[PDB]
Paper text:
Here, we demonstrate that [name] is the primary aspartate [name] (AspAT) in Mtb, non-redundantly catalyzes the specific biosynthesis of Asp in vitro, and is essential for axenic growth and survival of Mtb in macrophages and in mice. The overall fold of [name] is similar to that of other members of the recently described type Ic subgroup of PLP-binding proteins. Each monomer consists of a core domain (Pro52-Gly302) that folds into a nearly perfect α/β motif comprised a central eight-stranded (predominantly antiparallel) β-sheet surrounded by eight α-helices. [name] also contains an N-terminal auxiliary domain (Ser2-Leu53 and Asp303-Ser430) that stacks and forms an elongated segment on top of the core domain, and consists of five α-helices and an antiparallel β-sheet.
In the asymmetric unit of [name] pre-incubated with Kyn, we observed that the chains were bound to either the external aldimine intermediate PLP-kynurenine (PLP-Kyn), or the final keto acid product kynurenic acid (Kyna). In the unbound form of [name], the positively charged guanidinium side chain of Arg36 points outward and lies above the entrance of the active site pocket. Upon binding Kyn, however, we observed that the side chain of this residue is positioned more inward (by ~12 Å measured from the Cζ atom) and interacts with Kyn. Upon moving inward, Arg36 forms a bidentate salt bridge with Asp140. This ligand-induced conformational change is reminiscent of the so called “arginine switch” observed in type Ia AspATs, although here the Arg residue moves toward the substrate rather than away. In our structure, we observed a sharp peak of a water molecule in close proximity to both the active site Lys257 and the PLP-KYN intermediate. We speculate that this is the same water molecule responsible for the generation of the keto acid Kyna, from the PLP-KYN intermediate. When compared with Kyn, the carboxylate moiety of Kyna is rotated by ~180° and faces the entrance of the solvent-exposed binding pocket. Interestingly, in all the Kyna-bound chains, Arg36 adopts its original “outward” conformation, most likely facilitating the release of the product. Our data thus show that the aliphatic backbone of Kyn mimics the dicarboxylic amino acid Asp, and provide a possible explanation why [name]—and potentially other AspATs—display side activity towards the structurally disparate Kyn.
Author numbering:
A (entry chain A), B (entry chain B): 2 to 424
């Protein structure tokens, strides 16, 4: 254990780490733990999509999916995800291949036009616009707010959601706070799922801004690492009962169900928000790709079809997550320099190494050929005040590559730890 | 000859037309000439896309199209349209199913961020922003500028392009004019193709705004109604020789080549404009749908494959355009109340009836069950100052429906003419 270590014991331990690191570099590795994309083996599960939908190009309504028209998306596919998400079909639309693009356009519409009940477009707010950002969180959420000039306020994540006490306090006195980024199930990468009590408070709390929005990015809605699927909290129902029906914007995607970048996105909200979004989305496109929505409807068949498909993903992913946890445990637990999540779903593991050493750890790994996500990536402005957090993405590499990559990463974290202790 | 006539005879002809209109009212019609979309017969030409790409999900470069990554689009598909458009592959990207969406986002980026060489974002221009709009023009272009609060200035269309003399005088002295909408080949709905000399002048003219842009929406680039395809003028090359390389934004689409709403879009520009667009598009999406780009590349094979496919469209469309022309000629020519285009390509015929009667003509047709595009639809703010222009969309209906609909429209146009003449 490294808080109990003598001065000689630390110098010798640092020396052993130096040899481990020397040995590691001599292996000339070329490994990568940085992107959360499905493995080829996962993608193969959806290869039937590559020959679908075949000659019958009509959906169950009789719609010719090959021709212009229809902003809402195919109702038959929406009905499947309506069940999975617990959102009524009229409150859910299906888009193109990117939920991020839906999230981006909603922010852009808010800047240029204002939301459905905004006093003015957000670009006209002379004191600027703020979003609350539970951390660790999703760097592509932060990039959207950063690029639009929206200030980001980081919020600690707790076991069953973010720090709602803190959130409630900020929004009570600051009318400039217009939004909050969330991934409310198996968060990227905390792995935290918001409890019902957390959700109830977030949709009931009084906000100084009358048009405050929850960006409810349910990217991992069905993405279990066990054989159970999580119950979806009824965020839209709770918000309406609280008198804030327009507050949540719900997003989902099949990027990690079928093809990453070749899937279908979803947006859910109040009827007022659906009409608001479609009014402005109609200036941008005649409508989404109905053929790809038809392929997905034919492939899935129904919601049980999606569930069955997700357990097939789970059987591939779960051993990779178990391996990462075991390796971190065997290399790091005794030193007590680190801690990590053991998620029940989602695509990431969040590792905290010794404070003050995360950047160094990442740099050490890069010079032995192990690519590790940049330090601070899960924080707005890439600013991790403790310089401790590293994201690990287990999905893509083979099991043997994953073992080599995480064992090397652990070697780098230990040497970085002894380096800082000696100073 | 209506305009030279004899008052009881004018009254008698009006009585004649009324009998024609009563007859039309009997036939209990339900017809529609408003839909600029491919017929089901045209869409059938591309039904093999519904089973593509099949088992081989890799492009020629080995890219797994089922997984994340890559903003430019598949190089093999870009190479086909690079040849068709005369734009080098690095200067052309392929998007999702909507070129309109590319145009919208570029305008949105210009408002929020400014273009690559703008002095400031357009939303920071205290005197506002204007676009030049050749008329008749594309209403969805006008909807983008209208929704963004960009003032539109209509420009008369002439035989070989818009009124370049007028355009040159406006842009030289007004720094608020930032852009011009164009459809430079087979314009929607004028059918006018910009001449080589016109293109040359538009890319050389001095503009008061240093970041003036030509929105070069080449929607109908290969969409001939004869057995020959137009030359593509090298707008990007000519602009670069003029010292204005950033001036043109080129757009294209397969919406009327393969599936309308299920095709692939394209954006072309200087290397600076490509990098500028992708920088901000990268905040919106991880990237476009490579699998649909793969289906199109596999379906088309090469540029000659696209050309032959377009000739298959021409065989379906040309008799429909010929029928409309034949009916208008036989019913309206003697009266001299009207004139219409005879386009060599594109999707529309532009009809001018007697000035002051277009709104009435449309109402009369609707009241006998013939839906006709509303007066002013091809003008910014829906303002046709002469109340004469009607757009005809020949592509969608069957030959018998097209014949009945255009013949009905003529009766309404004739009846509307005699009404105003007696008044
Ligand atoms: C919470 C949340 N919301 C939306 C999305 C995007 O989903 P859409 O495809 O529908 O737009 C995500 C996805 N995250 C992944 C994927 C990712 O970034 C990535 C980026 C570049 C190259 C490869 C990649 N694998 C990651 O963080 O690595 C996400 O976690
Ligand atoms: C001139 C023009 N530009 C753009 C578009 C939009 O095409 P897309 O389907 O690629 O958005 C159309 C529709 N045919 C059009 O006529
Ligand atoms: O939904 C539509 O029917 C629609 C909308 C458009 O902008 C079109 C443009 C060109 C051609 C057909 C079009 N059709």
């Amino acid at each position: 254990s490294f808080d109990s270590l003598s001065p000689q014991e630390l110098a010798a331990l640092h020396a052993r780490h130096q040899q481990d690191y020397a040995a590691l570099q001599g292996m000339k590795l070329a490994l990568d733990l940085t992107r959360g994309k499905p493995s080829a083996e996962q993608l193969d599960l959806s290869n039937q999509l590559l020959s679908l939908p075949g000659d019958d190009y009509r959906d169950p309504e009789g719609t010719d999916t090959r021709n212009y028209g229809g902003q809402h998306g195919l109702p038959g596919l929406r009905a499947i995800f309506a069940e999975l998400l617990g959102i009524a079909v009229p409150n859910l639309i299906a888009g193109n291949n990117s939920s991020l693009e839906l999230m981006h356009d909603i922010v852009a519409f808010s800047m240029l036009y204002g939301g459905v009940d905004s006093p003015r477009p957000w670009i006209q707010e002379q004191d600027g616009i703020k979003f609350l950002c539970p951390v660790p969180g999703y760097d592509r959420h932060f990039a959207i707010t950063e690029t639009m000039g929206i200030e980001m306020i980081p919020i600690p994540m707790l076991q069953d959601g973010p720090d709602v006490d803190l959130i409630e306090e900020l929004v009570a006195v600051d009318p400039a706070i217009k939004g909050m980024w969330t991934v409310p199930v198996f968060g990227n990468p905390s792995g935290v799922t918001y409890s019902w009590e957390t959700v109830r408070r977030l949709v009931q709390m009084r906000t100084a801004a009358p048009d405050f929005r929850l960006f409810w990015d349910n990217a991992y809605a069905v993405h279990t690492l066990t054989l159970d699927f999580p119950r979806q909290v009824d965020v839209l129902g709770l918000a309406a009962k609280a008198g804030n029906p327009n507050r949540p914007y719900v997003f989902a995607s099949t990027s990690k169900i079928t093809f990453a970048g070749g899937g279908v996105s979803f947006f859910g909200g109040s009827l007022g928000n659906i009409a608001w979004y479609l009014q402005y989305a109609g200036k941008k496109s005649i409508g989404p790709d109905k053929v790809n929505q038809l392929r997905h409807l034919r492939f899935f068949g129904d919601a049980d079809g999606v569930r069955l498909h997700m357990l097939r993903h789970q059987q591939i992913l779960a051993p990779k997550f178990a391996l990462v946890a075991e390796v971190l445990d065997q290399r790091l637990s005794e030193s007590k320099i680190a801690s990590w999540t053991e998620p029940k779903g989602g695509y990431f593991i969040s590792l905290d190494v010794l404070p003050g050493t995360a950047r160094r750890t990442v740099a050490l790994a890069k010079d032995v050929g192990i690519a590790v996500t940049e330090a601070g990536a899960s924080f707005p402005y890439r600013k991790d005040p403790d310089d401790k957090n590293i994201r690990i993405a287990p999905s893509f590499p083979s099991v043997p590559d994953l073992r080599n990559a995480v064992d090397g990463l652990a070697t780098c974290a230990l040497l970085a730890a002894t380096e800082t202790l000696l100073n």
